[PDB]
Design a protein around this nucleic acid. Structure first.
Lengths: 143, 194, 91
RNA sequence: GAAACAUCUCAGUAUCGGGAGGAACAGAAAACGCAAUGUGAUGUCGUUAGUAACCGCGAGUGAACGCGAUACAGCCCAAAC
RNA sequence: AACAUAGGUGACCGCAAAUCCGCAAGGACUCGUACGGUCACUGAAUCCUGCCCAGUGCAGGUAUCUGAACACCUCGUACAA
């Protein structure tokens, strides 16, 4: 391609002789500070800034999911048949989580539900998950 | 069984031990590096670390220096932090213990060492005993215990050279799980020196 | 200069109510420095210029030095700080 | 390198001193800490992860527990008598 | 015309010294001892070499003031910072 063509043009890339060499200055990013026009040009990536977010509790001894949205479930039932197993009454609930990594089992409520109406049991559920649940059907979970 | 020669060697200023310490090292002092000894100074500790009367066992004293320093000064390019620079302030990581164990061993080329530890010394040098074994000997290569410090020297060779010993295998490592990071995976080599 | 020393109204803080009169105080007291990274960090890592030990710290000081003065709302008697202006002198 | 530079970085690198083997070194918990009615010597490989942590909190630096693998192996003194 | 020089002068030191080398073990001066030998300035002879101790340097003293850490006391912390 363009890169393939290198010969035929003196200097490849930026045209110049004595062209771009080690520059502009400093190694990597120039000092995040002022320099004699070396590097600057008002910035604000960063602003705040110590890359990444971290929480000390966040780690071992930290709370863990899984979390499920009250969308997949409704999508799951009653509209389409799915896990025939764990089916009773108009509907039922139980583990349908990719991981039963523990400290978990909540169900969030988003999307339109009940619609099943479904009754669910799991670890604690968000407020906007009780509603659009307890409404048509649904109720207490994982006492 | 040998309790108080453990108990006694605690204070080193208590009573009898101190007097022996008055007349002890008087003779040891004015005795240079490399000696030898019929019996260990502390019988509990030898015959603890591993020492029994048996042929093929030899225990030597050693003296050392006193404090640790004695170092050369860096050439130019001193200007800097300075980083590795300095003079009399730095202390060397190897103990005047580890140093006692070799500086023995390189006296008797033939033999290896399970290492005992010092008796105390004053105003200067410390001492140390240091039992050594002997690999090609009989009775050494008999007792299951005090075997394997000679196989015959296939893996263990110049133990305490490599380091594998008591004080060494301490010093540059202690503990196990936890705080054995940047320490012995096996050791400093690998997990680049701390 | 020698102001405001006054009864005002704005109270905007943890304990408040209707704006009520407060007063100026020029609160000066407490422990000084070495509560933050610094003394702690020169506990350790002291060899031959670690950190910014060598550089002058806390910026240079100029002629003035801001104002302090907490304005406590007389009532609740609890208050908060406002912006500080560089006053040549306070009296 | 940090577009200078002192900590930091290059780097525990280059180079130096001593020494073993056919492999070395480690190694049967005063461990781990998904805190548990849980794991169960040690290397190594993959990952955990550029995560926690460090740092003119700048530039840069940078693990581990665990997990999946490989290979598996547990024992002898000192003392008591 | 520069250096050296004899000559002139000042300084430190009684020797387990002054001065200097070495990381250390040790070492030069020194088979030396003040009519010595170390450190400096001036630079044969002749006539001479004034005034200044404020600043800087060195040295001596110093009621009072300032002046680190250990140990000591008080507070704080069941300990510690």
């Amino acid at each position: 391609t363009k890169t393939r063509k290198h010969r035929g043009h003196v200097s490849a890339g930026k045209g110049r002789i004595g062209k771009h060499r080690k520059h502009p200055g400093g190694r990597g990013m120039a000092g995040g500070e002022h320099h004699h026009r070396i590097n600057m040009d008002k910035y604000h990536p960063g602003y705040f800034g110590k890359v990444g977010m971290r929480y000390f509790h966040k780690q071992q001894a930290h709370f863990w999911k899984p979390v499920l949205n009250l969308d997949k479930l409704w999508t799951l039932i009653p509209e389409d048949k799915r896990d025939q197993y764990l089916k009773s009454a108009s509907k039922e609930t139980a583990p349908v989580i990719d991981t039963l990594a523990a400290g978990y089992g909540k169900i969030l409520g988003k999307g339109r539900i009940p619609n099943v109406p479904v009754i669910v049991k799991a670890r604690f559920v968000s407020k906007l998950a009780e509603e659009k649940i307890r409404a048509a059907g649904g109720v207490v979970e994982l006492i | 069984a040998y309790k108080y020669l453990e108990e006694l060697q605690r204070k080193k200023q208590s009573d009898v031990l101190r007097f022996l310490q008055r007349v002890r090292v008087w003779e040891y002092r004015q005795k240079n590096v490399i000696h030898r000894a019929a019996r260990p100074t502390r019988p509990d500790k030898a015959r603890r670390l591993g020492y029994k009367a048996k042929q093929g066992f030899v225990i030597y004293r050693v003296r050392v220096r006193r404090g640790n320093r004695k170092r050369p000064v860096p050439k130019g390019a001193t200007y800097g932090k300075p980083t590795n620079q300095g003079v009399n302030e730095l202390k060397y990581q190897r103990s005047l213990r580890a140093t006692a164990e070799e500086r023995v061993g390189r006296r008797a080329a033939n033999l290896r060492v399970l290492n005992s530890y010092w008796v105390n010394q004053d105003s200067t040098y410390k001492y140390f005993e240091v039992i050594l074994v002997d690999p090609q000997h009989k009775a050494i290569r008999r007792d299951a215990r005090y075997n394997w410090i000679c196989d015959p020297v296939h893996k263990h060779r110049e133990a305490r050279g490599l380091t594998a010993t008591g004080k060494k295998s301490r010093g540059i490592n202690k503990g196990h799980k936890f705080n054995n990071t940047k320490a012995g995976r096996r050791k400093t080599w690998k997990r680049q020196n701390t | 200069v020698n102001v405001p020393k006054t009864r005002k109204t704005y109270c905007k803080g943890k304990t408040c109510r209707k704006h009520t009169q407060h007063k100026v105080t020029q609160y000066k007291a407490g422990k000084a420095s070495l509560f933050a990274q610094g003394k702690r960090r020169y506990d350790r890592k002291q060899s031959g210029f670690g950190g910014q030990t060598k550089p002058v710290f806390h910026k240079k000081a100029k002629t003035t030095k801001k104002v302090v003065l907490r304005l406590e709302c007389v009532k609740c008697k609890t208050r908060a700080q406002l912006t500080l202006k560089r006053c040549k002198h306070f009296e």
